[PDB]
C-alpha cells in the first residue's frame, strides 16, 4: 500500500514537472487488477481477459 500511495504522489509530481505545460488537474484514476475500464485496456495490443486467472 505504501507503493500505491507514494506512487500516487510520484505520478502527481511527474504531472507538474513536464516541460510542455499541461493541465494541473489531470485526473489520477486508480485501477485494480482484474477490474479495468476499457479506457485503460484499449492502449494494449491483444488484451487477454483470462491471462492472470489460472
Amino acid at each position: 500500500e505504501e507503493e500505491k500511495t507514494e506512487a500516487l504522489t510520484s505520478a502527481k509530481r511527474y504531472i507538474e514537472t513536464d516541460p510542455a505545460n499541461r493541465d494541473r488537474r489531470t485526473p489520477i484514476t486508480v485501477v485494480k487488477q482484474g477490474f479495468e475500464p476499457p479506457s485503460f485496456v484499449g492502449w494494449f495490443l491483444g488484451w487477454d481477459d483470462d491471462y492472470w486467472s489460472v
Binding site: 509530481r13 514537472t17 513536464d18
Partner: protein, 373 residues
C-alpha cells in the same frame, strides 16, 4: 614470582636449572625451554619475551619452539651438547622479587633548564611508560649483564642525543661494567622488548583493547534512504538505437521454424506471417558496403512453450558456430522487436497468427471466423 625478569646467561648446560625458564636464541630459530618446577608467571613471561624477540627484533623472520624436559630438539642438543642431570631449583620466594625490583636505573638527559643535566628518574622497576617524556633523552642501565639503552625522543635536540650517547659511554668505566656491554640506541616506536620488560604494561599504539573486532573484508549494501524525484523520468531520455543495422532491410534472408526437435524452412511466399505459439530463426545477409556481415535473429512467440524456445536457442548457437562465428545474434520476443527487424519484410506488416505446431498435435486448423487487430 611477581616481578619476573630476563637476564642474559652464558650458553651452557650448567647455566640451566629446573626451577626457572630459559630462552635459547639462535637467530632464525628460538627455543623456549620450560622447567618442571617453573611456575605460571615465568612461563607467561617466557612466552611474551619469545614472541617479542620474534616479532620485533627479527620482524617475524623467525620461528619459536616450545620444549620441556625429555623433548629437546636436535638443535638444542647440537648447540648445548649432551644433557646432564639438572640441579633442581629453589622455590620461588619474595627476596628475588626484590632483587628483580633493583636491576635498572632510569636517567634523564635534558637541556630544558638551560644547562647540562643528567638526573635520576627512578631506580625501582616496573617503571611508568608515561615517564618517558618525548622532548628529552632517557637512559636505562641494565649493565650487570652488559646492556645500556639510550632512548631518544622525537622532539629532543641533537646535543641532547650526543650528550646521552656520551653519558652512556661514560657509564662503562665508572661503575666497572664488563667489556661486552652493548649500548643500544632506540628511537620512539622502535623499542627492543628487552627494554620493554622494565615497564608496567607497555602499550604499543595499535594494540587491541578487549576482544576486538574483525575486519570481514566484504560489506553488504547500506544505501541511505533518499526520496526519489520523478522529474528525472521525462528528462534525460538517453537512447542508444542501432549500431550496424543501417540498411532498410531488403537483403537476402532465410527463415526457419522449429517443429519438435528440428528446424524446417518456411515457404518463401510467407515471410512476415508468424505463428504465436512457434519459434523462428531468421538469418539475414547485409548487402550494405559496411564490410557485409550477417545477423541471426531468434524470434520467440508468447504462446510458445519451453521446448521450442530452448531448441531455438540451441539451433541459433549451432547456426552461429557452423558459419564460422562471423554473425552476431539478437534474441527477440514478441512485441519487443527492433525497427530493423520490422523493416525486413519491406513495408509489409508483421502478421501474427494464433496457435501453431506441437509435438503431439501438429499444425492447428484455423478458425472459421477470424479477427485481426
Amino acid at each position: 614470582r611477581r616481578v619476573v625478569r630476563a637476564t642474559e646467561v652464558p650458553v651452557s648446560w650448567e647455566s640451566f636449572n629446573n626451577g626457572d625458564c630459559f630462552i635459547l636464541d639462535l637467530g632464525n630459530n628460538i627455543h623456549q625451554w620450560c622447567g618442571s618446577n617453573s611456575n605460571r608467571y615465568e612461563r607467561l613471561k617466557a612466552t611474551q619475551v619469545s614472541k617479542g624477540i620474534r616479532d620485533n627484533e627479527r620482524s617475524g623472520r623467525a620461528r619459536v619452539h616450545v620444549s620441556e624436559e625429555g623433548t629437546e630438539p636436535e638443535a638444542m642438543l647440537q648447540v648445548l651438547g649432551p644433557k646432564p642431570a639438572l640441579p633442581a631449583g629453589t622455590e620461588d620466594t619474595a627476596k628475588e622479587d626484590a632483587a628483580n625490583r633493583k636491576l635498572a636505573k632510569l636517567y634523564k638527559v635534558s637541556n630544558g633548564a638551560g644547562t647540562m643535566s643528567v638526573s635520576l628518574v627512578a631506580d625501582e622497576n616496573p617503571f611508568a611508560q608515561g615517564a618517558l617524556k618525548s622532548e628529552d633523552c632517557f637512559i636505562l642501565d641494565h649493565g650487570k649483564d652488559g646492556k645500556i639503552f639510550v632512548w631518544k625522543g622525537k622532539q629532543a635536540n641533537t646535543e641532547e642525543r650526543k650528550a646521552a650517547l656520551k653519558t652512556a659511554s661514560d657509564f662503562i668505566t665508572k661503575m666497572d661494567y664488563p667489556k661486552q656491554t652493548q649500548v643500544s640506541v632506540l628511537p620512539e616506536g622502535g623499542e627492543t622488548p628487552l627494554f620493554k620488560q622494565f615497564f608496567k604494561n607497555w602499550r604499543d599504539p595499535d594494540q587491541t583493547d578487549g576482544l576486538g573486532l574483525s575486519y570481514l573484508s566484504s560489506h553488504i549494501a547500506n544505501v541511505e534512504r533518499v526520496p526519489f524525484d520523478a522529474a528525472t523520468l521525462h528528462t534525460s531520455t538517453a537512447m542508444a538505437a542501432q549500431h550496424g543495422m543501417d540498411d532498410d532491410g531488403t537483403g537476402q534472408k532465410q527463415i526457419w521454424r522449429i517443429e519438435g526437435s528440428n528446424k524446417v524452412p518456411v515457404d518463401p511466399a510467407t515471410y512476415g506471417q508468424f505463428y504465436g505459439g512457434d519459434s523462428y530463426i531468421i538469418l539475414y545477409n547485409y548487402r550494405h558496403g559496411g564490410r557485409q556481415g550477417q545477423i541471426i535473429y531468434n524470434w520467440q512467440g508468447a504462446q510458445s512453450t519451453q521446448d521450442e524456445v530452448a531448441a531455438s536457442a540451441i539451433l541459433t548457437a549451432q547456426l552461429d558456430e557452423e558459419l564460422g562465428g562471423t554473425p552476431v545474434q539478437s534474441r527477440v520476443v514478441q512485441g519487443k522487436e527492433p525497427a530493423h527487424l520490422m523493416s525486413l519484410f519491406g513495408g509489409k506488416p508483421m502478421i501474427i497468427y494464433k496457435g501453431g505446431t506441437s509435438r503431439e498435435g501438429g499444425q492447428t486448423a484455423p478458425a472459421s471466423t477470424r479477427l485481426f487487430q
